[PDB]
Design an enzyme around this catalytic site. Structure first.
Site, mmCIF file in Angstrom:
data_model
loop_
_atom_site.group_PDB
_atom_site.id
_atom_site.type_symbol
_atom_site.label_atom_id
_atom_site.label_comp_id
_atom_site.label_asym_id
_atom_site.label_seq_id
_atom_site.Cartn_x
_atom_site.Cartn_y
_atom_site.Cartn_z
ATOM 1 N N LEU A 77 -8.134 -68.807 -39.170
ATOM 2 C CA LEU A 77 -7.531 -69.464 -38.017
ATOM 3 C C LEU A 77 -7.967 -68.691 -36.765
ATOM 4 N N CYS A 81 -12.691 -68.231 -30.787
ATOM 5 C CA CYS A 81 -12.289 -66.985 -30.150
ATOM 6 C C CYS A 81 -12.652 -65.709 -30.905
ATOM 7 N N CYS A 86 -14.635 -65.484 -27.208
ATOM 8 C CA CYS A 86 -13.968 -64.398 -26.478
ATOM 9 C C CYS A 86 -14.057 -62.996 -27.042
ATOM 10 N N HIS A 136 -9.844 -61.970 -38.072
ATOM 11 C CA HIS A 136 -9.652 -63.136 -38.940
ATOM 12 C C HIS A 136 -8.394 -62.889 -39.765
ATOM 13 N N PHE A 500 -0.147 -45.556 -8.070
ATOM 14 C CA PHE A 500 -1.397 -44.964 -7.573
ATOM 15 C C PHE A 500 -2.017 -44.027 -8.627
HETATM 16 C C1 LIG Z 1 -1.422 -32.795 -10.173
HETATM 17 C C2 LIG Z 1 -0.621 -33.933 -9.520
HETATM 18 C C3 LIG Z 1 -0.971 -35.286 -9.812
HETATM 19 C C4 LIG Z 1 -0.302 -36.398 -9.272
HETATM 20 N N1 LIG Z 1 -0.698 -37.707 -9.625
HETATM 21 C C5 LIG Z 1 0.033 -38.792 -9.044
HETATM 22 C C6 LIG Z 1 -0.365 -40.063 -9.406
HETATM 23 O O1 LIG Z 1 -1.303 -40.334 -10.192
HETATM 24 N N2 LIG Z 1 0.381 -41.108 -8.816
HETATM 25 C C7 LIG Z 1 1.441 -40.939 -7.932
HETATM 26 O O2 LIG Z 1 2.032 -41.936 -7.473
HETATM 27 N N3 LIG Z 1 1.813 -39.656 -7.583
HETATM 28 C C8 LIG Z 1 1.112 -38.610 -8.141
HETATM 29 N N4 LIG Z 1 1.483 -37.334 -7.801
HETATM 30 C C9 LIG Z 1 2.531 -37.040 -6.878
HETATM 31 C C10 LIG Z 1 2.083 -37.216 -5.436
HETATM 32 O O3 LIG Z 1 0.907 -36.365 -5.264
HETATM 33 C C11 LIG Z 1 3.054 -36.787 -4.405
HETATM 34 O O4 LIG Z 1 4.343 -37.376 -4.622
HETATM 35 C C12 LIG Z 1 2.712 -37.131 -2.937
HETATM 36 O O5 LIG Z 1 1.379 -36.590 -2.661
HETATM 37 C C13 LIG Z 1 3.615 -36.506 -1.963
HETATM 38 O O6 LIG Z 1 3.253 -36.859 -0.623
HETATM 39 P P1 LIG Z 1 3.933 -36.174 0.593
HETATM 40 O O7 LIG Z 1 3.416 -36.813 1.780
HETATM 41 O O8 LIG Z 1 5.403 -36.103 0.410
HETATM 42 O O9 LIG Z 1 3.389 -34.681 0.451
HETATM 43 P P2 LIG Z 1 1.946 -34.013 0.479
HETATM 44 O O10 LIG Z 1 0.942 -35.002 0.062
HETATM 45 O O11 LIG Z 1 2.084 -32.788 -0.373
HETATM 46 O O12 LIG Z 1 1.571 -33.576 1.920
HETATM 47 C C14 LIG Z 1 2.370 -32.715 2.718
HETATM 48 C C15 LIG Z 1 1.515 -32.511 3.936
HETATM 49 O O13 LIG Z 1 2.148 -31.660 4.930
HETATM 50 C C16 LIG Z 1 1.237 -30.622 5.328
HETATM 51 N N5 LIG Z 1 1.973 -29.456 5.697
HETATM 52 C C17 LIG Z 1 2.759 -28.562 4.927
HETATM 53 N N6 LIG Z 1 3.285 -27.600 5.622
HETATM 54 C C18 LIG Z 1 2.857 -27.817 6.923
HETATM 55 C C19 LIG Z 1 3.073 -27.137 8.141
HETATM 56 N N7 LIG Z 1 3.825 -26.035 8.224
HETATM 57 N N8 LIG Z 1 2.479 -27.644 9.283
HETATM 58 C C20 LIG Z 1 1.713 -28.760 9.239
HETATM 59 N N9 LIG Z 1 1.446 -29.494 8.072
HETATM 60 C C21 LIG Z 1 2.106 -28.884 6.959
HETATM 61 C C22 LIG Z 1 0.298 -30.467 4.154
HETATM 62 O O14 LIG Z 1 -0.832 -29.742 4.557
HETATM 63 C C23 LIG Z 1 0.128 -31.840 3.654
HETATM 64 O O15 LIG Z 1 -0.921 -32.570 4.279
HETATM 65 C C24 LIG Z 1 0.801 -36.122 -8.354
HETATM 66 C C25 LIG Z 1 1.163 -34.771 -8.061
HETATM 67 C C26 LIG Z 1 0.476 -33.702 -8.627
HETATM 68 C C27 LIG Z 1 0.960 -32.315 -8.243
HETATM 69 C C1 LIG Z 2 -19.158 -67.249 -25.389
HETATM 70 C C2 LIG Z 2 -17.753 -67.692 -24.964
HETATM 71 C C3 LIG Z 2 -16.841 -66.737 -24.440
HETATM 72 C C4 LIG Z 2 -15.527 -67.055 -24.015
HETATM 73 N N1 LIG Z 2 -14.687 -66.044 -23.478
HETATM 74 C C5 LIG Z 2 -13.373 -66.439 -23.056
HETATM 75 C C6 LIG Z 2 -12.574 -65.454 -22.537
HETATM 76 O O1 LIG Z 2 -12.903 -64.246 -22.403
HETATM 77 N N2 LIG Z 2 -11.290 -65.883 -22.132
HETATM 78 C C7 LIG Z 2 -10.815 -67.177 -22.231
HETATM 79 O O2 LIG Z 2 -9.666 -67.446 -21.849
HETATM 80 N N3 LIG Z 2 -11.641 -68.145 -22.763
HETATM 81 C C8 LIG Z 2 -12.892 -67.772 -23.162
HETATM 82 N N4 LIG Z 2 -13.724 -68.746 -23.696
HETATM 83 C C9 LIG Z 2 -13.319 -70.099 -23.877
HETATM 84 C C10 LIG Z 2 -12.448 -70.251 -25.117
HETATM 85 O O3 LIG Z 2 -13.247 -69.745 -26.239
HETATM 86 C C11 LIG Z 2 -12.081 -71.637 -25.503
HETATM 87 O O4 LIG Z 2 -11.497 -72.371 -24.418
HETATM 88 C C12 LIG Z 2 -11.073 -71.779 -26.655
HETATM 89 O O5 LIG Z 2 -11.607 -71.010 -27.773
HETATM 90 C C13 LIG Z 2 -10.915 -73.175 -27.125
HETATM 91 O O6 LIG Z 2 -9.969 -73.276 -28.195
HETATM 92 P P1 LIG Z 2 -9.787 -74.624 -28.979
HETATM 93 O O7 LIG Z 2 -8.707 -74.397 -29.915
HETATM 94 O O8 LIG Z 2 -9.687 -75.755 -28.023
HETATM 95 O O9 LIG Z 2 -11.206 -74.737 -29.730
HETATM 96 P P2 LIG Z 2 -12.008 -73.866 -30.828
HETATM 97 O O10 LIG Z 2 -11.619 -72.436 -30.722
HETATM 98 O O11 LIG Z 2 -13.444 -74.181 -30.581
HETATM 99 O O12 LIG Z 2 -11.646 -74.295 -32.268
HETATM 100 C C14 LIG Z 2 -11.777 -75.616 -32.773
HETATM 101 C C15 LIG Z 2 -11.408 -75.449 -34.226
HETATM 102 O O13 LIG Z 2 -11.463 -76.705 -34.945
HETATM 103 C C16 LIG Z 2 -12.277 -76.563 -36.124
HETATM 104 N N5 LIG Z 2 -12.882 -77.840 -36.402
HETATM 105 C C17 LIG Z 2 -13.842 -78.602 -35.681
HETATM 106 N N6 LIG Z 2 -14.152 -79.735 -36.251
HETATM 107 C C18 LIG Z 2 -13.388 -79.782 -37.416
HETATM 108 C C19 LIG Z 2 -13.259 -80.729 -38.460
HETATM 109 N N7 LIG Z 2 -13.946 -81.880 -38.475
HETATM 110 N N8 LIG Z 2 -12.377 -80.446 -39.502
HETATM 111 C C20 LIG Z 2 -11.660 -79.297 -39.519
HETATM 112 N N9 LIG Z 2 -11.725 -78.301 -38.521
HETATM 113 C C21 LIG Z 2 -12.662 -78.695 -37.502
HETATM 114 C C22 LIG Z 2 -13.200 -75.402 -35.799
HETATM 115 O O14 LIG Z 2 -13.805 -74.923 -36.962
HETATM 116 C C23 LIG Z 2 -12.344 -74.488 -35.035
HETATM 117 O O15 LIG Z 2 -11.564 -73.608 -35.836
HETATM 118 C C24 LIG Z 2 -15.111 -68.452 -24.153
HETATM 119 C C25 LIG Z 2 -16.029 -69.410 -24.669
HETATM 120 C C26 LIG Z 2 -17.316 -69.045 -25.063
HETATM 121 C C27 LIG Z 2 -18.208 -70.156 -25.590
HETATM 122 O O1 LIG Z 3 -5.479 -67.896 -29.684
HETATM 123 S S1 LIG Z 3 -5.535 -67.364 -31.077
HETATM 124 O O2 LIG Z 3 -4.441 -66.373 -31.284
HETATM 125 O O3 LIG Z 3 -5.405 -68.501 -32.054
HETATM 126 C C1 LIG Z 3 -7.127 -66.539 -31.340
HETATM 127 C C2 LIG Z 3 -7.225 -65.245 -30.563
HETATM 128 S S2 LIG Z 3 -8.769 -64.365 -30.931
HETATM 129 O O1 LIG Z 4 -1.296 -42.116 0.794
HETATM 130 S S1 LIG Z 4 -2.533 -41.812 1.586
HETATM 131 O O2 LIG Z 4 -3.243 -43.087 1.909
HETATM 132 O O3 LIG Z 4 -2.152 -41.106 2.844
HETATM 133 C C1 LIG Z 4 -3.644 -40.758 0.600
HETATM 134 C C2 LIG Z 4 -4.229 -41.511 -0.590
HETATM 135 S S2 LIG Z 4 -5.415 -40.510 -1.543
#
Ligand SMILES: Cc1cc2nc3c(=O)[nH]c(=O)nc-3n(C[C@H](O)[C@H](O)[C@H](O)COP(=O)(O)OP(=O)(O)OC[C@H]3O[C@@H](n4cnc5c(N)ncnc54)[C@H](O)[C@@H]3O)c2cc1C
Ligand SMILES: Cc1cc2nc3c(=O)[nH]c(=O)nc-3n(C[C@H](O)[C@H](O)[C@H](O)COP(=O)(O)OP(=O)(O)OC[C@H]3O[C@@H](n4cnc5c(N)ncnc54)[C@H](O)[C@@H]3O)c2cc1C
Ligand SMILES: O=S(=O)(O)CCS
Ligand SMILES: O=S(=O)(O)CCS
Ligand SMILES: NC(=O)c1ccc[n+]([C@@H]2O[C@H](COP(=O)([O-])OP(=O)(O)OC[C@H]3O[C@@H](n4cnc5c(N)ncnc54)[C@H](OP(=O)(O)O)[C@@H]3O)[C@@H](O)[C@H]2O)c1
Ligand SMILES: NC(=O)c1ccc[n+]([C@@H]2O[C@H](COP(=O)([O-])OP(=O)(O)OC[C@H]3O[C@@H](n4cnc5c(N)ncnc54)[C@H](OP(=O)(O)O)[C@@H]3O)[C@@H](O)[C@H]2O)c1
Lengths: 522, 522
Positions: A77, A81, A86, A136, A500
């Protein structure tokens, strides 16, 4: 011959193995018979096809308490896809993205030298073939054990009338028929199209018995053509795309489309617009040796031993239309009203059979809605304003209007994008997030970190369109689209909590501009 | 000493270069003075610190038509995020994910043999140091040229009183002050904590002048510790984490946390709970040679020349509190009411300075809300029910309640997750989508394809929590959380348009069960 599996409960992995065995069966394999022989009810619907539309329609109908039967010619079935659409497409696109990264940082850090490296296309297709029985297996298992469905697999269905279906030697009756047989690969009517070396998405995963040469020709310019073409290019092969009109017309935002196309060309891809293949040249052994095509600048000849056709899909409506007398559309699609009803009483059509958009959401939902209607719940379905996406070496997501489109359509607008419009252009370290950090930080690679943009109505302040090129935004677009359909404004987007660094910077970028009554682009 | 940049208009890349020069200047570099000396209006607020909180707060205040001034001791805007926090963290996590991929498929396809391969940590840190000015440049450019912000950089601010601040040898008055100086890295009170070879997120990107040995000890068990620890492990080093209590308590769903922890240990990471470092051993050269710690099973000594501290951050409140008389909290956080107002008149505090959660959304939003309040718009900010995430070698996203937590809350629930609970366990080709296809299809790698789950109330049918391990769902959680706060049901979730194959399979899986009145887990 016929296997009654009804009371057998294979695990996911056992089903995988069984399906493989049935597929490698010289005689075609035994029929998989999963019918409940206790239920006195007449099937509310028999699904012709157990792909995305058929399986989901069945799951929903059953869940509603109705009875259903699926008949599918494949021993599994899920339909196209997991077998040739897909799923393999995503495996190939994953490879394209990872290979682009590897070629970009070749011989740096832990990345090996990709210089003279050519990855095997067959090698990767074989990987997919060797593991596609995994999906499958899940399908047969989940459908039987978790969704409580009845089905007959590895048996073509014989539709006698709008209430009668013949399968596995038996005859079944039903109040309704839901046709879900999908569509087949488009082709060309040129000499040599039947030569060895010519593939489409379906035959590629079934008949690739050799490793393609150094040049690949892709015909087509939309999703399939680009997704597979970028994968072929990624393996290290000169990839030439022959596009009848222009490529990726699906990407409405001009700047977004240009970014995606420019990045494809930067990877070495050749895209020839206004071109039509006139002949696929065969060598002495009947294998492709070149492709001849007419272009705006005259005829050209490209040497290759591997041609991939990425044309549309054609609804498999001929036979059913002949037997039932179904009204068809100009592309052969089965016509249906908003309730998924054909021209024939008690006969519905769903999925790819009814035409575009040919996406999984469309197939599954149409299947479900048809089921709900069959069960008495009158509900209409007319797919519109859905998010969309495609792969190149990047993930490309889009919904709504492009920038030029909105201005031309009379909307006064502002845009918020990344990178900003400056003389440094794309050569800056943003946008950036998961999977684009190396590009953002690498030497001379900043322009590869991505592109994204939201189009906003200056007066209503509502978001009119969103566009993204990079990685990790596809999933978000599913949910962002619902919010946008609900009336999302720049202020509401700005008031959300971002995670972020985020694939889409829409939330914080909106916040930087939402403080003004008069919006300014960023 | 003081560069008047007001009428200069550097590009993003010229800013990147200029900031680099100022940072490397032996004398400390010139002060960057960007003030409109012809604007006679009083400042509505002076921001002490121009990181996430200070920069966004400024952007919003200016957008509302108010006048602001930022003073920051760094020569760039953006704060810790681009210089030593979020940005490098994401570059390191990107490497960790790619490395796990390369090690898993070592010597397969285009993948190099990783067996005896140790990636240089300093090499990657050096890559970060070499490209961090890109982000710095954009911050300075965007702030000045697009957001119209006034700022004085590369100058510590010297607060005089709640209305007076000295910067660039000049005195500025303002109607309010908004304190946004952030927090500093936490440390341990143990002998040898100051030995060379001991780092935290800040010093790691400023002082790593050697390449670490084969063993790394990380102290801490939350986000910072785990993110950096997985990276160190991915480079090929034995990595031991010393957790005071339990690791990743932030992941409330036990099943989700277990999958994450299991995948980490599978990568070779050693996670020790209930452990406290007692001493950091130095060799005769003054470099860490080992770490001794007490654990539930007694004392242990780990030989290593590289220790990374991933403790919490400590609000930089001391000086400001002494000058202004600010009430502080137990951890030194500046206390504020819901309007971001400190105990001192016309003085607000935002970002990491006011404590947890220390996230970019909190920093940026608190800055903007403080700004709105300064501009006369009474608005409260109390962060609650926000999505969250962290990196291991995977992206880990969560929101709402875990399964056990929902039950203890008195909810009757069902869950929909992937992979399904069967005897094949995680050894199945789902979940799967972008960046997990190779794992899904690789020999024996299927259990690495991810884990995900939504928790639903069986009666109200509302989604109470969502959890995901894999790639590409983080951005989606930002938007999905908004929908959940709106009262999202499994039916509404199921009626959305998915973009298959999707990082989160929530939409279609919900659709599979939504057809029933009585919900059943999947
Ligand atoms: C390793 C790590 C990874 C993280 N990854 C993520 C993440 O993926 N996603 C997410 O949403 N958050 C993440 N965070 C958290 C995020 O970095 C902080 O919440 C955010 O940067 C805080 O911003 P802020 O403006 O409060 O402080 P800050 O960005 O720390 O900036 C404070 C600013 O004030 C300045 N400053 C300090 N003292 C003085 C001063 N006396 N005079 C003038 N300027 C001063 C600094 O120089 C600095 O520019 C991460 C934190 C760490 C530590
Ligand atoms: C290369 C490719 C990539 C794609 N990638 C995406 C994607 O990334 N995302 C997305 O949303 N869509 C994608 N699509 C589209 C998606 O595959 C189709 O819209 C979807 O599979 C159609 O489902 P369906 O059930 O209508 O048909 P089908 O999946 O084609 O199935 C029809 C079924 O009926 C059976 N059947 C046919 N005739 C008979 C019969 N006489 N007796 C008994 N059984 C029969 C078949 O054997 C089959 O099992 C892609 C299409 C292609 C061609
Ligand atoms: O949409 S179906 O779950 O039947 C096939 C996904 S590969
Ligand atoms: O949140 S700020 O746009 O100031 C820095 C992102 S790296
Ligand atoms: N979401 C996804 O990732 C995904 C991936 C693959 C497919 N799909 C869906 O599956 C369906 C089929 O895919 P598709 O890529 O073929 O899309 P499509 O939008 O149907 O495009 C067909 C492409 O084939 C070309 N074509 C058709 N007949 C041709 C002919 N006789 N000679 C030369 N070129 C010809 C078209 O060129 P011109 O437009 O220039 O005439 C066009 O580029 C679509 O509805 C698609 O959206 C979705
Ligand atoms: N979104 C992101 O990607 C990201 C990444 C990094 C940081 N951040 C944020 O930055 C802030 C600080 O980061 P964080 O990782 O430290 O988070 P945190 O949730 O504050 O955790 C602090 C960690 O330090 C340990 N710790 C503190 N004092 C200790 C001591 N004396 N001895 C031993 N261990 C000690 C804690 O151990 P016990 O709890 O076991 O006692 C805990 O593991 C948080 O608000 C965090 O969310 C976010």
């Amino acid at each position: 011959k016929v296997w009654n599996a009804r009371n057998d409960h294979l695990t996911i992995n056992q089903w995988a193995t069984r399906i493989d065995e049935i597929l490698e069966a010289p005689d075609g394999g035994e029929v998989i018979y999963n019918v409940d022989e206790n239920d006195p009810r007449e099937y509310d619907a028999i699904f012709i096809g157990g792909g995305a539309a058929g399986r989901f329609g069945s799951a929903y109908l059953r869940a509603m308490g109705g009875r259903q039967l699926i008949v599918d010619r494949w021993p599994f079935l899920g339909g196209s896809c997991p077998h040739n659409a897909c799923v393999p497409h995503h495996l190939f696109s994953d490879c394209a993205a990872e290979l682009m990264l590897a070629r970009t940082f070749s011989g740096q850090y832990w990345f090996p030298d990709m210089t003279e490296k050519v990855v095997g296309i067959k090698e990767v297709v074989d990987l997919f073939r060797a593991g596609r029985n995994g999906p499958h297996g899940i399908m047969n298992f989940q459908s039987k054990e978790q969704l409580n469905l009845e089905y007959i697999l590895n048996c073509p269905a014989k539709v006698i009338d709008n209430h009668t279906v013949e399968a596995a030697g038996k005859v079944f009756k039903a109040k309704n028929l839901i046709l879900a047989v999908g569509a087949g690969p488009g082709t060309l009517d040129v000499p040599g199209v039947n030569a060895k070396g010519v593939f489409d998405h379906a035959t590629l995963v079934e008949e690739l018995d050799y490793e393609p040469g150094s040049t690949v020709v892709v015909v087509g310019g939309s999703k399939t053509a680009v997704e597979y073409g970028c994968f072929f290019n990624a393996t290290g092969r000169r990839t030439v795309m022959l596009v009848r009109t222009e490529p990726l017309k699906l990407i409405k935002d001009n700047e977004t489309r240009a970014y995606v196309l420019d990045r494809m060309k930067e990877q070495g891809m050749e895209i020839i617009s206004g071109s039509n293949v006139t002949r696929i040249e065969e060598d002495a052994n009947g294998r492709v040796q070149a492709v001849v095509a007419m272009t705006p600048n005259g005829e050209m000849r490209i040497e290759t031993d591997f041609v991939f056709l990425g044309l549309g899909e054609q609804p498999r409506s001929a036979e059913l239309a002949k037997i039932l007398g179904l009204d068809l559309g100009p592309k052969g699609e089965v016509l249906v009203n908003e309730y998924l009803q054909t021209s024939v009483p008690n006969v519905y059509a769903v999925g790819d059979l009814i035409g575009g958009p040919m996406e999984m959401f469309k197939a599954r939902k149409s299947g479900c809605y048809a089921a709900r209607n069959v069960m008495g719940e009158k509900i209409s379905y007319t797919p519109k304003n859905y998010p969309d996406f495609l792969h190149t070496h990047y993930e490309v997501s889009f919904l709504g209007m492009g920038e030029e489109e909105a201005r031309a359509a009379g909307h006064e607008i502002v845009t918020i994008k990344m990178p900003p419009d400056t003389e440094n252009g794309l050569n800056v370290a943003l946008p950036a997030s998961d999977r684009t950090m190396l590009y953002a930080f690498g030497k001379g690679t900043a322009h590869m970190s991505g592109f994204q943009k939201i189009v906003i109505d200056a007066k209503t302040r509502k978001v009119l369109g969103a566009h993204h090129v990079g990685y990790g935004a596809k999933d978000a677009f599913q949910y962002l689209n619902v919010l946008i359909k609900q009336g999302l404004t720049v202020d509401e987007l700005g008031d959300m909590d971002e995670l972020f660094l985020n694939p889409t910077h829409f939330i914080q970028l909106s916040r930087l501009r939402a403080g003004s009554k008069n919006l300014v682009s960023l």
